[PDB]
């Protein structure tokens, strides 16, 4: 394996493992807040037992979430030295502000919530729980703001003096169109995950005669919250698709498997095999005039294809080669007025210059074959992105159907009258996790040739590390994560089997 | 009096009289929905008595609101024939759609709500009440969308063939920036009005020993709803001020009494006398670096003054004179290729051409004095706009303070422990009406030289009516409105004095 590929795989595994526990925390903390609010308002002590029992599992998941967060934090410096040195001036503000506000709030008040039952009164405990939920959500807000800036740079200009991109406007950095939609979408997905978790455990309890007081209320809360959250997350997924179409046409084309530009009634593929040796799909199942309506919100707005995008990036590749030559001349102390004036133009194509640097050993003289190789490498692997998008959409639709059925059964007041409803709720437990992992993988793999979109390719953003030095860390973290996952899943299963009646 | 001024005064009186009863309906229908929801959820029958008692007054106000709505609808055709013929292609969609959906919903379901107590169950009655509230709010939505398009035209292009402005894009017509903010702001103001009405009547009841069960719950509902609505309406008022600054600099300058452009730390006047004989204020009280921060959300963005706006409109006046000459030549059948090509340019200044037509008897030859008169008439009367804005802001601040005090007293559970709180709630009853009328007057008077902003002046939009023909209608409607107001206020006072215990 290559060093860059090994580091990419390490970041992939670490991110997936960390996000196996984040949506559960996001949903479960708000459901705990709901139970505490109901206990405060109604005054019935059943909801206090419910929130204690669910907070046990919440803490069990939260411990491992915190454990993985540290590695997620330090991986930028350990494995992406050049990436950090290049984009830190604009990337440090969200990362620092999140730890300054949201991480502090959640970290302090989670302990205050766990250990403040006897000391704090009902109102103070409710306020502490709400603070925990809001801090946990604001941390996701800032992290997803950073990731959205990665997807769509804004308020960023290259500086010759520091050889890095520096912040230009904080206002448009915070309020970039991609970041807001991404944040709301991911948070709604986490809400869906938590609600489905609660519903699955409640349905498992109700399938037997073990619990009927805590189980019914928990199932009702989960059903209502899941229906609202699934509606919100489907709407925000549509909005995210529109934003990706507007900002990153390459990612949209990879998602829909569109190779060649087609007239406005562009048929939306539902099943295809995007082979990359030949720039075409296989046994495609096309629904006419579907993707064009969704992506552009109207007609007569053709969606660019991968071939057209490569053809358009070819002049961008030439300009990037020129920009890279100019930047290397600048960095070597060659202060020429002509060079200084020329670098201001064609300055935004330096990422394509780095792509050519990867694909061309000699920058001064480049053949057509190297340009073809760079154009081929300018797009990600279409098939994994396509299948991840399809899996995510299908699982989202299944979640919508299941939660609508659960809400209909709950409002009727007859939840346990049908065994099949509870069985469906149980077997739909892994679906939110599958969908959320697929969506995150598609998001972070559709921009594959770019660590920062059109700014810095991932290949050149890697640090200076050897195969063994990275392999040791990869093996260590993989083994520790496997052991921790085994222990955490064992504890979660044990305390779900134990039931709230034990405590 | 002049015919145009008489028609303007008639529309002023009719609009003010109609809107004396609209915010009360908007707030009260949602408060009735709140009471019905509480009755359905808790099951206690006290809230049913509360919603019956408040729905009596709601219907009393609703009847006169409906009565005034018809005149508001037909006044466009009766007194503004040219305005309608000019802007109907773009103005009919909101007016027709509102009556198609929201007016139908509210009209049917208000009768269903009043007469469906015994027949419909609790859930159907609650759904009917919610439908009434949503229809009443959607009617305001569409009407304010039309008014916002008036304030800031969008998707409008002049057509030589029909001599009128025709719709270009419905999407940007609906979602224009001014209309959304105006709608949310006005609806929040109506919510504040309704909540303050409920709070005032409840405080009057609590000042005596007449009522303590209905009064306390009604006061709590009014206090919570009023606090939330006052926060929302202050935020939306700030947003509306920003939108007015961005779109209509003349209106903002009139509101703040700014005559000459000043450096970025522009001092916000709080007290001034904007004399118009001399383009300056009198005994101004200036707070430095206040209006520039609020209007532009930053510094180094100077706010244009009235003198600068007139100087900029002078070339617009010349271009409008040219456009009016070209349009008159086109309309007379003079189909010249040169004229056809030339009319496409300087086409958007036709409103200034109409202004010159009003201020210049001969369009072909115009002296500098006529241009000066047109420039003077291009801005509204600064003093009424300034004082209306100040009155609205002060009354909004007082509403915020009163409702915060009421919420603090309510959450403590001790509402009747302080007589001064109830007295303040009572004496704050006229303040929402004063503020809302002042705000509407400022909104519709800041654009005074324009029936449509930079498109059609109000003077040229009038129909062909005589002094006596308009005076008869004015006298008739004024007398009928006076009698109806006397009867309605007498009934409202009588049934507020009677109390819910009577029914």
């Amino acid at each position: 394996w290559d060093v860059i590929d090994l580091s990419r795989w390490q970041f992939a595994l670490t991110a997936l493992y960390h996000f196996l526990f984040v949506p559960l925390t996001l949903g479960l903390i708000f459901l705990l807040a709901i139970m505490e609010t109901i206990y405060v308002v109604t005054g019935k002590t059943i909801y206090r037992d419910m929130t204690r029992f669910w907070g046990k599992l919440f803490g069990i998941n939260f411990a491992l979430g915190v454990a993985t967060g540290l590695t997620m934090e330090f991986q930028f410096g350990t494995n992406w030295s050049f990436y950090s040195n290049y984009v830190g001036d604009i990337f440090g503000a969200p990362l620092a502000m999140e730890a300054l506000m949201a991480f502090f709030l959640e970290s302090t008040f989670v302990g205050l919530f766990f250990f403040g039952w006897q000391r704090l009164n009902k109102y103070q405990h409710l306020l502490v729980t709400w603070l925990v939920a809001f801090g946990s959500n604001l941390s996701a807000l800032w992290i997803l703001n950073a990731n959205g800036w990665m997807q769509y740079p804004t308020g960023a200009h290259f500086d010759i003096d520091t050889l890095r991109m520096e912040m230009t406007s904080f206002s448009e950095l915070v309020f970039n169109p991609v970041s807001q939609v991404k944040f709301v979408h991911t948070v709604m997905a986490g809400y869906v995950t938590g609600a489905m978790f609660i519903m699955a455990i409640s349905a498992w309890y109700l399938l037997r005669g073990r619990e009927r007081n805590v189980a019914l209320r928990s199932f009702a809360i989960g059903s209502v919250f899941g229906t609202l959250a699934i509606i919100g997350t489907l709407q925000l997924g549509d909005s995210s698709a529109y934003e990706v179409a507007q900002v990153q046409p390459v990612k949209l084309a990879a998602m829909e498997g569109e190779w060649q530009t087609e007239p406005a009634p562009a048929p939306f593929h539902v099943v295809a095999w995007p082979e990359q040796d030949q720039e075409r799909n296989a046994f495609a199942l096309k629904i006419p005039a579907l993707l064009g309506i969704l992506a552009t919100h109207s007609l007569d707005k053709p969606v660019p294809g991968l071939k057209n995008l490569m053809a358009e990036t070819y002049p961008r590749l030439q300009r990037g080669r020129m920009a890279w030559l100019l930047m290397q001349e600048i960095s070597q102390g060659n202060r020429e007025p002509h060079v200084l004036q020329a670098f201001r133009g064609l300055e935004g194509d330096l990422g394509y210059g780095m792509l050519l640097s990867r694909y061309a050993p000699d920058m001064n003289h480049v053949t057509a074959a190297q340009y073809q190789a760079a154009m081929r490498g300018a797009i990600p692997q279409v098939a994994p992105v396509f299948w991840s998008f399809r899996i995510m959409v299908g699982c989202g639709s299944l979640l919508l159907l299941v939660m609508l059925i659960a809400l209909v059964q709950t409002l009727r007041g007859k939840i346990d009258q049908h065994r099949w409803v509870l069985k469906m709720a149980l077997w739909s437990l892994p679906l939110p996790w599958i969908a959320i992992e697929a969506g995150w993988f598609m998001t972070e793999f559709g921009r594959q040739p770019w660590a920062i979109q059109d700014i810095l390719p991932t290949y050149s953003a890697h640090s200076a590390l050897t195969t063994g030095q990275l392999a040791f860390s990869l093996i260590m973290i993989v083994g520790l994560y496997t052991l921790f996952l085994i222990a955490e899943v064992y504890l979660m299963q044990k305390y779900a089997r134990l039931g709230p009646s034990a405590m | 009096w002049d015919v145009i001024d008489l028609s303007r005064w008639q529309f002023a009186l009719t609009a003010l009289y109609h809107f004396l009863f609209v915010p009360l309906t908007l707030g009260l229908i949602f408060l009735l929905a709140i009471m019905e929801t509480i009755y359905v959820v808790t099951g206690k029958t006290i809230y049913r008595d509360m919603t019956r008692f408040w729905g009596k007054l709601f219907g009393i106000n609703f009847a006169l609101g409906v009565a005034t709505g018809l005149t508001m609808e037909f006044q466009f055709g009766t007194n503004w024939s040219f305005y309608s013929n000019y802007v109907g292609d773009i103005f009919g969609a909101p007016l027709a759609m509102e009556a198609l959906m929201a007016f139908f919903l509210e009209s049917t379901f208000v009768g269903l709500f009043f007469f469906g107590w015994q027949r419909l169950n609790k859930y159907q009655h609650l759904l009917v009440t919610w439908l009434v509230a949503f229809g009443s709010n959607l009617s305001a939505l569409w009407i304010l969308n039309a008014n916002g398009w008036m304030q800031y035209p969008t998707g409008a292009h002049f057509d030589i063939d029909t001599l009128r402005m025709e719709m270009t894009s419905f999407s940007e017509l609906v979602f224009n920036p001014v209309s959304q903010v105006k709608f949310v702001h006005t609806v929040m103001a109506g919510y504040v009005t309704g909540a303050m009405f409920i709070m005032a009547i409840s405080a009057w009841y609590l000042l005596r020993g007449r009522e303590r069960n209905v009064a306390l719950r009604s006061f709590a509902i009014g206090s919570v709803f009023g606090t939330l609505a006052i926060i929302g309406t202050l935020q939306l008022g700030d947003s509306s001020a920003y939108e007015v600054a961005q779109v209509q600099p003349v209106k903002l300058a009139a509101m703040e009494g700014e005559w000459q452009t000043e450096p970025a730390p522009a001092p916000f006047h709080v007290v001034a006398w904007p004399e118009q004989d001399q383009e300056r204020n009198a005994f101004a009280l200036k707070i430095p670096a206040l209006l520039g921060i609020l209007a532009t959300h930053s510094l180094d963005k100077p706010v244009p003054g009235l003198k600068n706006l007139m100087a900029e409109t002078y070339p617009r006046l010349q271009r409008g004179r040219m456009a009016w000459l070209l349009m008159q030549e086109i309309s007379q059948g003079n189909r010249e290729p040169h004229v056809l090509q030339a009319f496409r340019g300087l086409e958007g200044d036709l409103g200034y051409g109409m202004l010159l037509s009003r201020y210049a008897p001969d369009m072909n030859h115009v002296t500098a004095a006529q241009y000066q008169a047109a420039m003077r008439g291009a801005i509204p009367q600064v003093a009424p706009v300034f004082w209306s804005f100040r009155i609205m802001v002060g009354c909004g601040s007082l509403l915020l303070l009163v409702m915060l005090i009421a919420l603090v007293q309510t959450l403590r559970g001790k509402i009747d422990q302080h007589r001064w709180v109830l007295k303040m709630a009572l004496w704050s009853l006229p303040l929402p009406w004063i503020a809302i009328e002042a705000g509407w007057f400022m909104t519709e008077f800041g654009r005074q030289p324009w029936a449509i902003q930079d498109i059609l002046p109000t003077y040229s939009a009038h129909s062909a009516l005589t002094t006596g023909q308009l005076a008869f209608s004015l006298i008739m409607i004024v007398g009928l409105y006076t009698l109806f107001l006397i009867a309605e206020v007498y009934l409202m006072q009588k049934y507020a004095r009677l109390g819910p215990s009577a029914m």
């Binding site: 939609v181 948070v187 809400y191 009702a220 007041g413 | 959820v41």
Partner: peptide, 28 residues
């Protein structure tokens, strides 16, 4: 502006769930 929308929406979802549970608790 999606941040304020999300804030209002999550508070709305919380209050809706609380109200539904308050209404439905006696019926269980």
């Amino acid at each position: 502006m999606w941040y304020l929308l999300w804030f209002v929406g999550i508070l709305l979802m919380c209050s809706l769930s609380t109200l539904v549970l308050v209404w439905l608790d006696p019926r269980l």
